[PDB]
Amino acid sequence: EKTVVNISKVDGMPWFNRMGEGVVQAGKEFNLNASQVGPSSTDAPQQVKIIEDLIARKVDAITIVPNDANVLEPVFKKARDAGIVVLTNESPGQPSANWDVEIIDNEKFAAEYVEHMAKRMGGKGGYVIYVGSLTVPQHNLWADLLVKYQKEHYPDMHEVTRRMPVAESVDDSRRTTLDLMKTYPDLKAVVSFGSNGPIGAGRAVKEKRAKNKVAVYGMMIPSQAASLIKSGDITEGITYDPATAGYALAAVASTLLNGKTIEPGFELKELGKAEVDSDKHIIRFHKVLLVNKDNIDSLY
Ligand SMILES: [Cl-]
Ligand SMILES: [Cl-]
Ligand SMILES: [Cl-]
């Protein structure tokens, strides 16, 4: 069978474990020898090393959620030059990827964050954004759009500080949330695009008994966030199922390895039709998931 290997941002995360379930499922469905490698840390050279080993192994396709788009470019070009398909998730515009695959529409996702935040604080107040790092591509693109949307809808909202690179750490997210709540009495919402961020922020909000005024929104695995969703310390997840991303990556790899070419009109039985931007080589699905007390038990 054709060999497909997915590479997460880092091992030891419920988010990426869920992704791997989708990879393994696609391997069954598409007759692939599929696997997922979790790096030992989020430092991008660890992903480069894994990719060098996969090129040496001469695998058929490498799929990856990059920690840094630019750090990986040379090794992605080395893979392509070797005849290996390179696919990303969370890296729209990655120059050497055959395609980037996304599970939500960026514009819509940002809007949903701001509208949900604005409703609860009456369109006025402070907020902050947590990102996984200052260079991770997709978190920063989402943050940029969220702020831009905010400024052209709710001028009485504002970032209390520039974005904080804490979203992959419960500790760092908790500490930052405690600090910012003490500093900014008008802080009313914390947004995290990393999945550990709402856990840390939610724990801080719980400790200070602050859930009435300080809302917490973000990306999350529902089961990991369940205790805090149920106690109201996490207000809402605005996210997607990363198993769908893992699956879609491997499904697109299958298409390409079978000699087919991706163009507008592309569809996956299990997902539906994607939008396909041939100029930027981005395949988008529209599968945003809202995680609230009302559906927390219906999820993974
Ligand atoms: Cl992993
Ligand atoms: Cl903690
Ligand atoms: Cl918790």
In three-state secondary structure terms, 151 is helix
Nearest 5°: phi and psi at 100?
Answer: -105, 140
Domains in the chain, number: 2
| Rounded distance from Cα 171 to ligand 3 centre (Å) | 12
Q: 82 and 158: one domain?
A: no
Method: X-ray
Q: 128 and 194: one domain?
A: yes
Q: 95 and 232: one domain?
A: no
Q: At what angle do helices 170-183 and 197-207 cross, to 10 degrees?
A: 50
Residue with tokens 């260079």: 135
The DSSP-derived string for 190-228 is EEESSSSHHHHHHHHHHHTT-TTT-EEEE---HHHHHHH
Partner residues linked to 102 by β-bridges: 284
Task: Count CB-CB contacts under 10 A for residue 266.
Answer: 16
E strands, the chain, are 2-7, 32-37, 61-64, 85-89, 99-102, 125-130, 157-159, 187-192, 215-218, 236-239, 267-268, 272-273, 275-277, 282-284, 289-291
Q: 188 and 98: one domain?
A: no
- Reading phi first (left if > 0) and then psi (alpha if -120 to 50, else beta), residue 119 is in alpha
Domain CATH for 179: 3.40.50.2300
Q: Which amino acid is at 172?
A: D
Q: 267 and 232: one domain?
A: no
| Rounded distance from Cα 265 to ligand 1 centre (Å) | 31
Q: 111 and 188: one domain?
A: yes
Surface-to-core class of residue 12, CB atoms within 10 Å of its CB (0-12 exposed, 13-18 middle, 19+ buried):
exposed
> Is the dihedral angle over the CA atoms 187, 189, 191, 195 positive or is it negative?
positive
Surface-to-core class of residue 152, CB atoms within 10 Å of its CB (0-12 exposed, 13-18 middle, 19+ buried):
exposed
> Is the dihedral angle over the CA atoms 52, 67, 175, 197 positive or is it negative?
negative
Task: Count CB-CB contacts under 10 A for residue 31.
Answer: 12
Q: 136 and 235: one domain?
A: yes
Q: 54 and 97: one domain?
A: yes
- Comparing CA positions, the residue from 137, 19, 131 lying closest to residue 71 is 137
Contact 165, 191 (CB under 8 A): no
Q: In which order are the strands placed within the sheet that holds 125-130? A: 157-159, 125-130, 187-192, 215-218, 236-239, 289-291
Q: 182 and 271: one domain?
A: no
Task: Count CB-CB contacts under 10 A for residue 260.
Answer: 11
Q: 30 and 85: one domain?
A: yes
Question: Per this entry, what is the length of the chain?
Answer: 300
| Rounded distance from Cα 198 to ligand 3 centre (Å) | 9
**Rounded Cα–Cα distance for residues 208 and 265 (Å):** 51
Residues around ligand 3, an ion, CB closer than 5 A: 227
**Rounded Cα–Cα distance for residues 247 and 23 (Å):** 5
What ligand is nearest to the CA atom of residue 234? 3
Number of alpha carbons in the 13 Å side-chain half-sphere of residue 19: 29
Q: 160 and 224: one domain?
A: yes
Supply the range of the domain harboring residue 269: 1-102+241-285
Contact 215, 188 (CB under 8 A): yes
| Rounded distance from Cα 207 to ligand 2 centre (Å) | 10
**Rounded Cα–Cα distance for residues 47 and 137 (Å):** 15
The DSSP-derived string for 57-85 is TT-SEEEE--S-HHHHHHHHHHHHHTT-E
DSSP code for 164: B
Q: 197 and 277: one domain?
A: no
**Rounded Cα–Cα distance for residues 103 and 248 (Å):** 9
**Rounded Cα–Cα distance for residues 123 and 116 (Å):** 10
| Rounded distance from Cα 198 to ligand 2 centre (Å) | 11
Give the pairing type, strands 32-37 and 2-7: parallel
| Rounded distance from Cα 14 to ligand 1 centre (Å) | 8
Partner residues linked to 86 by β-bridges: 62
| Rounded distance from Cα 177 to ligand 2 centre (Å) | 11
**Rounded Cα–Cα distance for residues 19 and 101 (Å):** 14
| Rounded distance from Cα 169 to ligand 3 centre (Å) | 13
| Rounded distance from Cα 16 to ligand 1 centre (Å) | 5
